[model samples]
Structures are given as structure tokens and as C-alpha cells.
Target: QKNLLCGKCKAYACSTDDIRIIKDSHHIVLGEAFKERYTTKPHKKPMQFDGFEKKSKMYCRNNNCQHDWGITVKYLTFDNLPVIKIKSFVMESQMDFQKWKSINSSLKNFDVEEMSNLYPPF
Candidate 1:
């Protein structure tokens, strides 16, 4: 069943295997919820990716489906600190993708910095 789906359609399952390393690193640098969705976890060593530093990560936790996926935000730092802020998340199901796309399109008129003020973190 999984093989029949496209990358975007597969949702979180499309990216689950890659999420751990991202979560580990982002939590170390950014914050707890940055790694886990709407929650926190114990500390761990950070991971590194070429030409990038992770700032945020997210996963779709809706079970009863095969789409275990997540996203990692990467950026570069200046003055010995990361200046770039990247936000990554995975869609868990087709419905999730639809909902996300809908909300994303709705926010097109708002500046990126204003997103937090407009929508709930979830």
C-alpha cells in the first residue's frame, strides 16, 4: 500500500526514518517542542548536516496509518550562532496534507514573522 503513494500523499511516513536525527539536533539547539510535536523530551547530543544547522522539527502523530513523517529546519549561523531559522514538518495522511495546504494558502498574505501570532502552534 505504501509503494502506491506519492511523496506528498504519503505524509509523515514519507519522512519518519529521517526524523530522529533531526529531532535530536534541533532539540539540542532550539527547544524541546521543536523536536517533538506539542511536547518535550530528554536532552541528547546534537546532529549535524552539511551546510546546514537544524532549527525546528515536527511529525504527524496520527496513528492507524502508515505515514510517519517529519520535517527539519536548517540554517546557517553568524558570530558563532545560527542566524537562520528553518521550519520542517511531515504530513501524516492525505487529509493532513489537504488541511495543511489550505491553512498555508490562507496565510499567504501574512509575513512569516506574523505566523505565530495568527495560528495556533499545532
Candidate 2:
């Protein structure tokens, strides 16, 4: 007999109408919330990196979203080409802010050379 459990699962249920409503509303709610909270904080100043320069600029092209923030990291590569990693995150709650701050503090003091001796990099 065919497995009835798979067919009965709600996870498999989807409709074109339901998905559009869910996607649009969720994105709008998150975008608005992020904008309100971020505005209360002081504007972040751009950081300069040593031995690295911006080869290309990063920009958010999402017009429907009201959230504003962008990040770009520059690094020197073995191939002599400048590398960049662009990323973004939306802080929707105070918990997110706290968590990010905690992680940032940990990373700032992280010593890769010391850590590698204690824990193998394999």
C-alpha cells in the first residue's frame, strides 16, 4: 500500500494564492520593523581595510523593501585579485541586536594562530 503519512502532511500542502500572500506580507512586516529600529541607532561609519580596496560596490536592489544596510568585506587573495564578500542582515528584534553584539565581541578577540595550535584546522 502507498504511504498515507506523506500525503496527509501539511508541509506538502501549498497553493499559488497562499504562497504569494505569505511571502509579500512577511517581507513587508520585516522590512518596516527593521527600518524603525535601525533609525534609532547612530549611523554606522564605513570601515577601511588594510591592503585591500573596493573593486566593486554593493547595493540592495530590492525596491519593495524599506530596510537599508549593506556590508562588504575586502580581502587579499593568493591569486593577486582583491576579493570581496557582500552580506546583509535585518534586525527585527532586540534579541537579534544582543546576539549580534555578543558574536562581534567574540570575533574581535579571536586569535586564529593560537586557536589552530590548540585545535587542529582539519
Candidate 3:
């Protein structure tokens, strides 16, 4: 079966053989999460719209795929155990193609937003 996290990416592979980095619980530079060498300040402004950083990284192992990227997931405690949620998969380069409105829909939260308000909704 394909890796759930790996499948999250629009990449050609479903697993990572080299362990690029960040299995889980990494922090983002701008949000409340703690910082580490792994914590990265997003290179693009749109990528920072979420107000938080990556909590996980998933990659593909296939050399042909050689997927060189991953996504950010949010990890927190609900009932005191653990809860993981998808934050973003699109990168700085992919931001133009993806919409914050749709990502927030998948997250079941209306939090993700952008400044380029083309027009107000009715």
C-alpha cells in the first residue's frame, strides 16, 4: 500500500529511502511552534499565510520520482493523546495554482486566507 503521508504529495513516489528530514513534530519560524534546525522560514509569502510551519515531511523513494519535497502537518493534543492534521502540501512555487479557500476546506477550518481579495463573496 502507498504511504498515507507520502501519498499526500502530488509526487510520483510514495516513500522516501534517504529520509530527507522531519518525520513528525517540527516547528515553523513564524508561529507558536518551537524552532529547530528543521524549522524553516518559508521562502514565499503565500506559503506563510497559514501562520504556522511544518510539523511533518513526507517524501518518495523512487529514483525516477526522486520527489524533492514534502508537506506540513499540524500536530496537537485533543484528548491528551495525539492528533495530526494536514496543513499544506503546496510549495512556494505551487502557490499560484493552489487556493487557500480550497485548502482550508480540506482542513475543515476556515482559517487559511490570503490578501489578494479579488472580490467579496455574497
Question: Against the true structure, whose TM-score is highest?
Answer: 2
Model 1 segments more than 4 A misplaced = 1-31, 38-67, 78-94, 103-105, 108-122
Error of 1 at 104 (Å): 6.3
Evaluate all candidate structures by whole-model CA lDDT and list the values in order. Answer: 0.29, 0.24, 0.27
Deviation from native of the Cα of residue 3 in model 3, angstroms? 16
Candidate 2 residue 21 C-alpha distance from true site, Å: 38
Pairs of residues clashing in candidate 1: 11-91, 12-68, 12-69, 12-91, 13-67, 13-68, 77-82
Q: Is candidate 1 or candidate 2 better by TM-score?
A: 2
lDDT score at residue 38, model 1, on the 0-100 scale: 24
Q: Considering every candidate listed, which one attains the maximal lDDT?
A: 1
RMSD of each: 11.7, 17.5, 15.1
lDDT of 2 by residue, 68-87 (tens): 33222222221111111111
Q: Please, what is the TM-score per model?
A: 0.23, 0.27, 0.22
RMSD of 1: 11.7
Q: Residue by residue across 13-64, what tens digits does model 1's lDDT show? A: 2222121122223311222332332221222235454444433333334333
Cα deviation at 30, candidate 1, in Å, is 8.7
Better of 2 and 3 by TM-score: 2
